[PDB]
Symmetry: D2
Subunit: 115 residues, 4 copies
């Protein structure tokens, strides 16, 4: 029993594809979820918190991401919340191990190809 | 305090775009979600959820997706209690979609930016 | 790849503890979840989910909760397509519970550690 | 549209109740979600990642938490993911603004009182 979450947002930049020594592909990126707060006084719905989530995806699904998504795409993401330890000069970070992901058809249309 | 859910699965039938005489557009599609563990091992159970999305998105949906497409759907769980004048006691569930996209798990897609 | 949901709401009726002749214990309860925004404004819509939990938890549930209790439920969305030999075409949904607890939003509780 | 999540875990310590200058109560705590990985070789299900989430809850619901929960209780939590900026000597942190919360009846029974 892991802690999963769905994140809707935009990619801060282009997907970053590298390779492990053994050859498996990995893509990393952050998504930016911006909520809209109502403001029951002056103006209608405004822009809320930031929320920058670093997700990393693997092997052949990561290959697909690198080929389909770019800077500032609106995506839907579902994944597991992981926690990593980085060294000072020492605390934690929170990332999203991606299970599924795809371009949101809210403001865009897509041309899909199955493998 | 609405109950929301995320659902991954494949569409069971091409989307059904329709227009309200008020000029608004609507898409209806149902998602079939099916677990699948492996070895000694495969398949297991299923879930069919009637879904609907409104406005622009609905048009993009009907243009981008087809039967069998693996989509990720997020939305709200709506429920109605129909009939009683027949004796019975029926109930149905649907999902008012917020966001939806094709999955890039087994596919690649060219996202025509629009 | 199971579809899970979180649900907040009140129990509609005291839990129904039962024992299987195999010595296992089972709890059945349905949650009613109802949105409620305010001013000019109150109430709106509803959701009834048949729930079931097994084993130890089931015993604790039947001892801790009653009708009207506000619980937080997390679990799995199970669905069955019953009947057809009647002409019709019925479908029902239930929730196989993983975790459940009373909500401390409008209540306090003394958690007898056990 | 915020990013919400459900966290099941245990409180690392006792709830910490303070008060804003105006009088509103606030409770803070971290929950510890430990997943169990199967290990299809030697041993059955093991203990997985850590996952420490700092949740903070407000006014009169926080009062209720401070009165009902203690060190190492198993709780269910549902909330929004917030991101805060702390000063170096400068990056971000991720916390959970709690909506609802309660003791899980998995291994414990509870005696509830309505207000």
């Amino acid at each position: 029993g892991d802690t999963t979450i769905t994140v809707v947002g935009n990619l801060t930049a282009d997907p970053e594809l590298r390779f492990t020594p053994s050859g498996a592909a990995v893509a990393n990126f952050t998504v930016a979820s911006t909520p809209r707060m109502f403001d029951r006084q002056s103006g209608e719905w405004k822009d809320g918190e930031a929320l920058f989530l670093r997700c990393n995806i693997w092997r052949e699904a990561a290959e697909n991401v690198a080929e389909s998504l770019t800077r500032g795409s609106r995506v839907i993401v579902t994944g597991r919340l992981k926690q990593r330890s980085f060294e000072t000069r020492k605390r934690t970070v929170v990332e999203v191990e991606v299970d599924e992901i795809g371009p949101s058809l809210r403001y865009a249309t897509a041309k899909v190809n199955k493998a």
